[PDB]
Tab-separated table of C-alpha atoms in Angstrom:
chain	number	residue	atom	x	y	z
A	5	UNK	CA	0.000	0.000	0.000
A	6	UNK	CA	3.059	2.252	0.318
A	7	UNK	CA	3.875	4.439	-2.687
A	8	UNK	CA	4.353	8.066	-3.716
A	9	UNK	CA	3.430	9.929	-6.913
A	10	UNK	CA	5.471	12.908	-8.144
A	11	UNK	CA	3.768	15.414	-10.462
A	12	UNK	CA	5.556	17.886	-12.716
A	13	UNK	CA	3.155	20.790	-12.289
A	14	UNK	CA	1.131	22.331	-9.496
A	15	UNK	CA	-1.963	20.727	-7.958
A	16	UNK	CA	-1.221	17.173	-9.081
A	17	UNK	CA	-1.276	18.148	-12.773
A	18	UNK	CA	0.995	17.228	-15.686
A	19	UNK	CA	3.262	14.242	-16.184
A	20	UNK	CA	3.441	11.946	-13.179
A	21	UNK	CA	5.914	9.394	-11.839
A	22	UNK	CA	5.143	6.625	-9.352
A	23	UNK	CA	7.655	5.013	-6.995
A	24	UNK	CA	6.715	1.930	-4.976
A	25	UNK	CA	10.122	1.467	-3.315
A	26	UNK	CA	13.461	3.348	-3.572
A	27	UNK	CA	13.728	5.045	-7.000
A	28	UNK	CA	17.275	6.247	-7.480
A	29	UNK	CA	16.853	8.543	-10.504
A	30	UNK	CA	13.648	9.735	-12.173
A	31	UNK	CA	14.871	12.922	-13.860
A	32	UNK	CA	14.336	11.495	-17.367
A	33	UNK	CA	10.644	11.188	-16.446
A	34	UNK	CA	10.102	14.455	-14.518
A	35	UNK	CA	12.227	17.545	-15.105
A	36	UNK	CA	10.937	19.143	-11.867
A	37	UNK	CA	8.341	18.378	-9.167
A	38	UNK	CA	5.607	20.765	-8.055
A	39	UNK	CA	3.074	18.325	-6.594
A	40	UNK	CA	3.313	15.091	-4.608
A	41	UNK	CA	0.868	12.488	-3.297
A	42	UNK	CA	2.210	10.132	-0.642
A	43	UNK	CA	-0.300	7.299	-0.753
A	44	UNK	CA	1.322	5.331	2.054
A	45	UNK	CA	4.322	5.078	4.285
A	46	UNK	CA	6.788	7.861	4.978
A	47	UNK	CA	9.259	8.966	2.310
A	48	UNK	CA	12.493	10.879	1.985
A	49	UNK	CA	12.664	12.708	-1.353
A	50	UNK	CA	15.994	14.044	-2.605
A	51	UNK	CA	17.006	16.953	-4.786
A	52	UNK	CA	19.737	15.152	-6.741
A	53	UNK	CA	19.914	11.592	-8.110
A	54	UNK	CA	21.088	8.731	-5.930
A	55	UNK	CA	19.829	10.236	-2.677
A	56	UNK	CA	22.013	13.346	-2.825
A	57	UNK	CA	21.471	17.004	-2.144
A	58	UNK	CA	18.688	18.542	-0.127
A	59	UNK	CA	16.353	15.918	1.322
A	60	UNK	CA	12.818	16.284	2.707
A	61	UNK	CA	10.671	13.944	4.820
A	62	UNK	CA	7.001	13.607	3.795
A	63	UNK	CA	4.484	11.440	5.670
A	64	UNK	CA	1.291	10.102	4.115
A	65	UNK	CA	-0.614	12.986	2.609
A	66	UNK	CA	-1.069	15.214	-0.389
A	67	UNK	CA	1.160	18.185	-1.214
A	68	UNK	CA	-0.232	20.447	-3.958
A	69	UNK	CA	2.763	22.799	-4.095
A	70	UNK	CA	6.415	22.242	-3.422
A	71	UNK	CA	6.294	24.591	-0.424
A	72	UNK	CA	4.003	22.128	1.349
A	73	UNK	CA	6.862	19.696	1.994
A	74	UNK	CA	9.025	22.704	2.960
A	75	UNK	CA	10.849	22.376	-0.366
A	76	UNK	CA	13.051	25.304	-1.302
A	77	UNK	CA	12.331	24.729	-5.010
A	78	UNK	CA	10.779	22.173	-7.372
A	79	UNK	CA	13.932	20.093	-7.983
A	80	UNK	CA	13.628	16.464	-6.957
A	81	UNK	CA	15.087	13.430	-8.673
A	82	UNK	CA	15.239	10.493	-6.189
A	83	UNK	CA	13.459	9.045	-3.170
A	84	UNK	CA	13.493	6.134	-0.702
A	85	UNK	CA	10.780	4.751	1.534
A	86	UNK	CA	11.468	5.147	5.239
A	87	UNK	CA	11.590	1.744	6.924
A	88	UNK	CA	10.429	1.655	10.538
A	89	UNK	CA	11.986	-1.172	12.564
A	90	UNK	CA	9.248	-2.961	14.410
A	91	UNK	CA	9.133	-3.032	18.149
A	92	UNK	CA	8.650	0.705	18.071
A	93	UNK	CA	11.724	1.585	20.098
A	94	UNK	CA	13.576	4.843	19.612
A	95	UNK	CA	16.774	5.732	21.416
A	96	UNK	CA	19.552	8.065	20.301
A	97	UNK	CA	22.915	9.251	21.606
A	98	UNK	CA	24.207	12.667	20.530
A	99	UNK	CA	27.821	13.714	20.975
A	100	UNK	CA	29.608	17.018	21.402
A	101	UNK	CA	32.633	15.964	19.333
A	102	UNK	CA	33.392	13.724	16.383
A	103	UNK	CA	33.890	9.958	16.638
A	104	UNK	CA	31.650	9.598	19.715
A	105	UNK	CA	33.807	11.828	21.908
A	106	UNK	CA	33.140	14.579	24.444
A	107	UNK	CA	29.777	15.266	26.052
A	108	UNK	CA	27.106	12.688	25.286
A	109	UNK	CA	23.340	12.771	25.870
A	110	UNK	CA	20.900	9.884	25.492
A	111	UNK	CA	17.158	10.204	25.000
A	112	UNK	CA	14.160	8.289	23.720
A	113	UNK	CA	12.140	11.495	23.182
A	114	UNK	CA	11.769	14.215	20.549
A	115	UNK	CA	13.840	17.378	21.045
A	116	UNK	CA	12.504	20.640	19.523
A	117	UNK	CA	15.401	22.645	21.034
A	118	UNK	CA	18.849	21.171	21.678
A	119	UNK	CA	19.861	24.496	23.262
A	120	UNK	CA	17.173	24.481	25.934
A	121	UNK	CA	17.413	20.785	26.757
A	122	UNK	CA	21.132	19.986	26.387
A	123	UNK	CA	22.882	23.394	26.159
A	124	UNK	CA	24.655	22.428	22.946
A	125	UNK	CA	24.634	24.479	19.769
A	126	UNK	CA	26.079	21.703	17.561
A	127	UNK	CA	26.055	17.923	17.186
A	128	UNK	CA	29.232	16.303	15.848
A	129	UNK	CA	28.586	12.560	15.929
A	130	UNK	CA	25.605	10.357	16.638
A	131	UNK	CA	24.567	6.814	17.464
A	132	UNK	CA	21.009	5.734	16.671
A	133	UNK	CA	20.631	2.827	19.080
A	134	UNK	CA	16.945	2.240	18.219
A	135	UNK	CA	14.453	3.672	15.729
A	136	UNK	CA	14.639	6.273	12.954
A	137	UNK	CA	15.146	10.000	13.467
A	138	UNK	CA	15.394	13.349	11.679
A	139	UNK	CA	18.036	16.014	12.326
A	140	UNK	CA	16.937	19.605	11.636
A	141	UNK	CA	19.145	22.645	11.166
A	142	UNK	CA	17.048	25.200	13.033
A	143	UNK	CA	15.014	24.526	16.200
A	144	UNK	CA	11.427	23.379	16.270
A	145	UNK	CA	11.936	21.120	13.282
A	146	UNK	CA	12.634	23.904	10.742
A	147	UNK	CA	15.320	24.451	8.131
A	148	UNK	CA	17.383	21.832	6.348
A	149	UNK	CA	16.529	18.215	7.204
A	150	UNK	CA	18.635	15.069	7.506
A	151	UNK	CA	17.457	11.463	7.856
A	152	UNK	CA	19.134	9.264	10.509
A	153	UNK	CA	18.502	5.522	10.187
A	154	UNK	CA	19.738	2.912	12.661
A	155	UNK	CA	23.514	3.317	12.343
A	156	UNK	CA	26.559	5.191	13.618
A	157	UNK	CA	27.529	8.662	12.433
A	158	UNK	CA	31.127	9.493	13.257
A	159	UNK	CA	30.880	12.938	11.623
A	160	UNK	CA	28.151	15.315	10.384
A	161	UNK	CA	28.942	14.476	6.757
A	162	UNK	CA	27.600	10.989	7.637
A	163	UNK	CA	24.063	12.265	7.975
A	164	UNK	CA	24.900	14.252	4.839
A	165	UNK	CA	25.380	17.692	6.404
A	166	UNK	CA	28.083	20.145	5.391
A	167	UNK	CA	28.203	21.730	8.855
A	168	UNK	CA	27.476	20.375	12.347
A	169	UNK	CA	24.479	22.721	12.775
A	170	UNK	CA	21.727	20.730	14.480
A	171	UNK	CA	19.150	22.433	16.664
A	172	UNK	CA	16.267	19.969	16.860
A	173	UNK	CA	15.534	16.333	16.187
A	174	UNK	CA	12.624	13.939	16.488
A	175	UNK	CA	11.373	10.457	15.786
A	176	UNK	CA	9.825	9.236	12.574
A	177	UNK	CA	6.482	7.820	13.654
A	178	UNK	CA	3.456	6.862	11.583
B	5	UNK	CA	20.401	0.247	-13.602
B	6	UNK	CA	21.162	-0.485	-9.973
B	7	UNK	CA	19.417	-3.841	-9.880
B	8	UNK	CA	17.530	-4.701	-13.113
B	9	UNK	CA	17.366	-2.952	-16.483
B	10	UNK	CA	14.693	-3.685	-19.083
B	11	UNK	CA	15.224	-2.857	-22.761
B	12	UNK	CA	12.619	-2.531	-25.500
B	13	UNK	CA	14.619	-4.119	-28.318
B	14	UNK	CA	16.863	-7.169	-28.468
B	15	UNK	CA	20.519	-7.049	-27.472
B	16	UNK	CA	20.144	-4.108	-25.093
B	17	UNK	CA	19.157	-1.675	-27.843
B	18	UNK	CA	16.221	0.740	-27.599
B	19	UNK	CA	14.362	2.420	-24.763
B	20	UNK	CA	15.262	1.129	-21.306
B	21	UNK	CA	13.806	1.206	-17.825
B	22	UNK	CA	15.579	0.679	-14.489
B	23	UNK	CA	14.000	-0.745	-11.342
B	24	UNK	CA	16.032	-0.544	-8.138
B	25	UNK	CA	13.510	-2.594	-6.165
B	26	UNK	CA	9.793	-3.342	-6.750
B	27	UNK	CA	8.175	-1.628	-9.748
B	28	UNK	CA	4.454	-2.228	-10.086
B	29	UNK	CA	3.928	-0.870	-13.606
B	30	UNK	CA	6.274	0.295	-16.347
B	31	UNK	CA	4.061	-0.267	-19.377
B	32	UNK	CA	3.912	3.496	-20.040
B	33	UNK	CA	7.664	3.631	-20.605
B	34	UNK	CA	8.131	0.241	-22.326
B	35	UNK	CA	5.670	-1.182	-24.834
B	36	UNK	CA	7.406	-4.581	-24.596
B	37	UNK	CA	10.714	-6.017	-23.369
B	38	UNK	CA	13.188	-7.927	-25.520
B	39	UNK	CA	16.312	-7.891	-23.311
B	40	UNK	CA	17.258	-7.472	-19.647
B	41	UNK	CA	20.386	-6.814	-17.599
B	42	UNK	CA	20.177	-7.991	-13.984
B	43	UNK	CA	23.062	-6.107	-12.369
B	44	UNK	CA	22.619	-7.889	-9.033
B	45	UNK	CA	20.452	-10.192	-6.931
B	46	UNK	CA	17.548	-12.266	-8.215
B	47	UNK	CA	14.444	-10.720	-9.720
B	48	UNK	CA	10.879	-11.862	-10.370
B	49	UNK	CA	9.427	-10.214	-13.504
B	50	UNK	CA	5.761	-10.281	-14.549
B	51	UNK	CA	3.955	-9.916	-17.865
B	52	UNK	CA	1.084	-7.760	-16.575
B	53	UNK	CA	1.135	-4.774	-14.218
B	54	UNK	CA	0.894	-5.113	-10.457
B	55	UNK	CA	2.741	-8.461	-10.520
B	56	UNK	CA	0.166	-10.304	-12.597
B	57	UNK	CA	0.213	-12.792	-15.428
B	58	UNK	CA	3.160	-14.900	-16.466
B	59	UNK	CA	6.123	-14.686	-14.118
B	60	UNK	CA	9.766	-15.550	-14.612
B	61	UNK	CA	12.718	-15.625	-12.184
B	62	UNK	CA	15.971	-14.069	-13.400
B	63	UNK	CA	19.204	-14.668	-11.489
B	64	UNK	CA	22.027	-12.169	-11.897
B	65	UNK	CA	23.251	-11.898	-15.462
B	66	UNK	CA	22.483	-10.560	-18.915
B	67	UNK	CA	19.616	-11.605	-21.180
B	68	UNK	CA	19.767	-10.501	-24.843
B	69	UNK	CA	16.492	-12.102	-25.994
B	70	UNK	CA	13.205	-12.855	-24.316
B	71	UNK	CA	13.715	-16.567	-24.800
B	72	UNK	CA	16.785	-16.310	-22.560
B	73	UNK	CA	14.526	-16.060	-19.483
B	74	UNK	CA	12.085	-18.754	-20.698
B	75	UNK	CA	9.780	-15.955	-21.817
B	76	UNK	CA	6.734	-16.952	-23.812
B	77	UNK	CA	6.896	-13.522	-25.446
B	78	UNK	CA	8.339	-10.031	-25.059
B	79	UNK	CA	5.517	-8.714	-22.797
B	80	UNK	CA	6.669	-7.535	-19.361
B	81	UNK	CA	5.243	-4.855	-17.067
B	82	UNK	CA	6.338	-5.262	-13.417
B	83	UNK	CA	9.117	-6.702	-11.293
B	84	UNK	CA	10.036	-7.525	-7.710
B	85	UNK	CA	13.346	-8.349	-6.097
B	86	UNK	CA	13.286	-11.780	-4.490
B	87	UNK	CA	14.340	-11.712	-0.856
B	88	UNK	CA	16.463	-14.578	0.426
B	89	UNK	CA	16.058	-14.910	4.217
B	90	UNK	CA	19.208	-15.141	6.281
B	91	UNK	CA	20.531	-18.607	6.989
B	92	UNK	CA	20.641	-20.577	3.763
B	93	UNK	CA	17.847	-22.863	4.989
B	94	UNK	CA	15.579	-24.650	2.517
B	95	UNK	CA	12.762	-27.014	3.438
B	96	UNK	CA	9.412	-27.703	1.743
B	97	UNK	CA	6.493	-30.061	2.287
B	98	UNK	CA	4.258	-31.006	-0.631
B	99	UNK	CA	0.823	-32.495	-0.121
B	100	UNK	CA	-1.257	-34.794	-2.283
B	101	UNK	CA	-4.415	-32.975	-1.175
B	102	UNK	CA	-5.460	-29.372	-0.772
B	103	UNK	CA	-5.048	-27.593	2.551
B	104	UNK	CA	-2.136	-29.574	3.996
B	105	UNK	CA	-3.977	-32.900	3.980
B	106	UNK	CA	-3.239	-36.319	2.524
B	107	UNK	CA	0.063	-37.960	1.724
B	108	UNK	CA	2.996	-35.657	2.306
B	109	UNK	CA	6.600	-35.586	1.132
B	110	UNK	CA	9.289	-33.312	2.510
B	111	UNK	CA	12.597	-32.322	0.951
B	112	UNK	CA	15.479	-29.906	1.389
B	113	UNK	CA	16.786	-30.319	-2.147
B	114	UNK	CA	15.822	-29.461	-5.700
B	115	UNK	CA	13.525	-31.920	-7.501
B	116	UNK	CA	14.004	-31.946	-11.295
B	117	UNK	CA	11.310	-34.637	-11.694
B	118	UNK	CA	8.253	-35.005	-9.454
B	119	UNK	CA	7.305	-38.166	-11.343
B	120	UNK	CA	10.670	-39.776	-10.743
B	121	UNK	CA	11.231	-38.793	-7.114
B	122	UNK	CA	7.671	-38.756	-5.773
B	123	UNK	CA	5.619	-40.832	-8.246
B	124	UNK	CA	3.096	-38.074	-8.907
B	125	UNK	CA	2.619	-35.097	-11.211
B	126	UNK	CA	0.384	-32.925	-9.035
B	127	UNK	CA	1.177	-30.813	-5.983
B	128	UNK	CA	-2.010	-29.669	-4.249
B	129	UNK	CA	-0.827	-27.640	-1.242
B	130	UNK	CA	2.459	-27.050	0.444
B	131	UNK	CA	4.375	-25.397	3.239
B	132	UNK	CA	7.662	-23.555	2.751
B	133	UNK	CA	9.265	-24.081	6.139
B	134	UNK	CA	12.545	-22.475	4.989
B	135	UNK	CA	13.791	-20.551	1.994
B	136	UNK	CA	12.097	-19.670	-1.277
B	137	UNK	CA	11.375	-21.967	-4.203
B	138	UNK	CA	10.135	-22.050	-7.793
B	139	UNK	CA	7.420	-24.377	-9.199
B	140	UNK	CA	7.429	-25.382	-12.914
B	141	UNK	CA	4.821	-27.073	-15.089
B	142	UNK	CA	7.185	-29.347	-17.006
B	143	UNK	CA	10.123	-31.478	-15.769
B	144	UNK	CA	13.613	-30.111	-15.451
B	145	UNK	CA	12.619	-26.506	-14.787
B	146	UNK	CA	10.978	-25.887	-18.164
B	147	UNK	CA	7.695	-24.226	-18.982
B	148	UNK	CA	5.686	-21.911	-16.804
B	149	UNK	CA	7.136	-20.636	-13.508
B	150	UNK	CA	5.616	-19.836	-10.101
B	151	UNK	CA	7.325	-18.201	-7.112
B	152	UNK	CA	6.813	-19.365	-3.498
B	153	UNK	CA	8.096	-17.116	-0.698
B	154	UNK	CA	8.213	-18.592	2.832
B	155	UNK	CA	4.546	-19.050	3.733
B	156	UNK	CA	1.681	-21.535	3.389
B	157	UNK	CA	-0.075	-22.503	0.156
B	158	UNK	CA	-3.332	-24.331	0.795
B	159	UNK	CA	-4.424	-24.413	-2.875
B	160	UNK	CA	-2.561	-24.230	-6.220
B	161	UNK	CA	-4.026	-20.756	-6.784
B	162	UNK	CA	-1.993	-19.546	-3.790
B	163	UNK	CA	1.133	-19.759	-5.947
B	164	UNK	CA	-0.642	-18.299	-8.972
B	165	UNK	CA	-1.536	-21.557	-10.696
B	166	UNK	CA	-4.714	-22.453	-12.572
B	167	UNK	CA	-4.261	-26.193	-11.884
B	168	UNK	CA	-2.251	-28.491	-9.591
B	169	UNK	CA	-0.006	-29.304	-12.592
B	170	UNK	CA	3.580	-29.149	-11.330
B	171	UNK	CA	6.421	-31.350	-12.493
B	172	UNK	CA	9.575	-29.838	-10.942
B	173	UNK	CA	10.672	-27.381	-8.305
B	174	UNK	CA	13.947	-26.068	-6.977
B	175	UNK	CA	15.496	-23.635	-4.519
B	176	UNK	CA	16.300	-19.989	-5.209
B	177	UNK	CA	20.053	-19.752	-4.576
B	178	UNK	CA	22.362	-17.015	-5.745
């Protein structure tokens, strides 16, 4: 039941592309994207092919303009379904310094402000012990977004960020 | 083509379409398929959209003509990666009667001839205790193909068949 439909023009009009599961490059089918329907599941959609560039998380729902998924523009060319481990457990460790060094804070809860709750301005490495998470640049879940699946992130470039700026994070729940 | 690449004309000429995993319908981009590159893994490909109609299993390799995958014709519309569970375990039970009743045989090995090894030509229900298998209408893996992921099959229709007519089966190994 999980799939997403990208449309070239506004309000679900024009040429459309369907993805049922991880589509690594659809630019030959759609030259831009100005509408999206997420029929099921939760999806990361990426600006550049092979899951590169600016990403955006979209849960199930309809998005009649690119600004409705917070997109900065109408460029998308790849996407992968978000897989939720079952059990439903979320637990993360965030680190002051790279390679799991320095201050370290563990939580199972969402964090709309790292500053208020942990008195850090930056994250430099991460361990996702359980679940799937999103790192956001600005607080309260705004700005650039990064997807963090169950792994280890020795450095910010491992969640695909060019700086260590992280001010909020939360769980991916459906 | 990160996992499987379909081509409209023979010998990898013509329009092409890539599926990275699970594609429910590509008939809008390909009117027919005359050759296939399987860059990795093992793929189930289906004549009609949404995984319907004739199916064929394609291990890793290159296929310059539809006959090279036992195709009846050059009509293909959807595909699905086959998932091999961890362990390397393969066990199946085949039943003379529908719904797991009647005489039962159980094997861990490929059977190129149901008539020779089990003195019948008709499987009527079965249990895949381990692994994933293929069923064929004719001996020695020829003719029509049917995929069985690890589950229960109380009636031939559960594996997509229109009759109990099965004359060989084997394991999906890479």
